[PDB]
Amino acid sequence: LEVLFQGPNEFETLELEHLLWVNITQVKHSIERAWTRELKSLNLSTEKFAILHELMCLGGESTPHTLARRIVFEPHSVSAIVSRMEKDGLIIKTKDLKKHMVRIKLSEKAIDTFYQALEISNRVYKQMMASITREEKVELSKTLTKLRNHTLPLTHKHTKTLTPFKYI
Amino acid sequence: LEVLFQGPNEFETLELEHLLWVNITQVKHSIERAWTRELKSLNLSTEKFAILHELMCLGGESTPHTLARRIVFEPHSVSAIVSRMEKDGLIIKTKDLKKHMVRIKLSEKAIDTFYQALEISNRVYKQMMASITREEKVELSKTLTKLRNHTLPLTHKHTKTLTPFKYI
Ligand SMILES: Oc1ccc(Cl)c(Cl)c1
Numbered sequence: 001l002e003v004l005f006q007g008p009n010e011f012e013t014l015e016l017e018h019l020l021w022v023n024i025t026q027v028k029h030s031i032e033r034a035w036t037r038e039l040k041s042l043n044l045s046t047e048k049f050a051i052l053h054e055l056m057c058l059g060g061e062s063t064p065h066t067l068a069r070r071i072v073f074e075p076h077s078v079s080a081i082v083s084r085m086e087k088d089g090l091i092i093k094t095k096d097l098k099k100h101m102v103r104i105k106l107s108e109k110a111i112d113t114f115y116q117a118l119e120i121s122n123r124v125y126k127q128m129m130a131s132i133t134r135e136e137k138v139e140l141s142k143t144l145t146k147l148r149n150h151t152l153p154l155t156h157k158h159t160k161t162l163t164p165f166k167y168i
Numbered sequence: 169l170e171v172l173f174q175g176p177n178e179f180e181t182l183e184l185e186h187l188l189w190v191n192i193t194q195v196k197h198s199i200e201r202a203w204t205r206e207l208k209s210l211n212l213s214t215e216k217f218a219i220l221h222e223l224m225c226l227g228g229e230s231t232p233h234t235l236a237r238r239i240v241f242e243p244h245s246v247s248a249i250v251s252r253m254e255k256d257g258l259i260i261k262t263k264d265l266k267k268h269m270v271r272i273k274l275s276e277k278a279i280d281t282f283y284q285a286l287e288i289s290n291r292v293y294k295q296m297m298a299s300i301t302r303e304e305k306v307e308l309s310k311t312l313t314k315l316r317n318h319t320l321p322l323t324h325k326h327t328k329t330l331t332p333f334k335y336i
């Protein structure tokens with residue numbers, strides 16, 4: 001009845017640490033694809049929202065090097081996102097009055113967009129994660145934080161001082 | 169002594185579900201940046217390795233639509249990666265003898281590269297995740313699997329039948 005010689009091969013059984021990498025990548029892709037569609041009317045990708053958010057934690061005004069230190073992304077990535085946001089009218093760049101240093105500031109459009117995006121974003125993430133309990137969320141953050149603290153220094157050696165986000 | 173009016177503002181305190189999104193994104197970026205440097209001698213990015221791996225689970229030979237169904241990535245992404253791998257000599261594309269259907273096959277170079285990459289990749293992930301216990305790994309996979317199962321159908325409605333990876 002069942003056909004022979006069809007069933008899965010050895011490459012479908014993974015070490016648990018490799019399966020964890022597949023699980024992390026699948027959840028990041030799934031939760032971001034659903035969030036990006038709900039934020040479409042504000043024309044915000046996940047990385048434009050993360051840079052908006054970091055600049056709101058910095059009081060709406062910083063420099064490229066301080067913004068890069070606070071976020072996980074690579075500096076060339078941070079710069080490309082900031083350029084796209086400058087073209088969208090979300091960031092104003094001005095020369096520091098320090099030769100070659102740039103200051104980056106959110107426009108009041110960007111701050112009002114962040115107004116709107118944070119409220120939608122909070123509902124989206126709450127509905128997405130309603131199938132895990134408060135306890136499972138707290139433990140997931142703790143485990144992921146352990147992994148981030150072990151692994152970020154393997155390639156970022158004093159170059160990041162990531163924003164110390166809290167929850168209650 | 170401590171300066172006044174400097175400490176963090178309200179945007180540094182998040183809802184736990186938003187902090188979980190930041191934690192997922194930070195761990196994915198940290199573990200991938202360290203893995204990509206160790207795999208550099210094989211010229212494999214994370215997505216070229218994931219497509220190599222999926223095609224090894226499919227017996228080294230499939231079609232673009234079957235490969236896309238098995239992996240989380242978007243089809244245009246899968247196609248762009250497959251094109252880059254065709255240029256690297258990792259994938260051979262041949263016309264099905266079905267007008268307009270393409271078959272994609274790994275070259276024996278690609279299979280030998282996967283030989284080497286899986287062994288390095290397993291050590292890299294084992295060393296990276298040595299700071300969490302077996303129990304914390306098992307629970308992390310379970311929680312992430314719950315989140316993936318809740319959230320993938322919000323935007324992928326019968327378009328994926330993801331490879332059912334196991335661990336022991
Ligand atoms: O709101 C944020 C802030 C930083 C990051 Cl890395 C992310 Cl994913 C979302």
Ligand SMILES: Oc1ccc(Cl)c(Cl)c1
Pocket residue numbers: 021022025026217218219221222239240
């Ligand atoms: O080895 C793999 C297979 C699929 C995915 Cl999505 C990943 Cl991240 C790694």
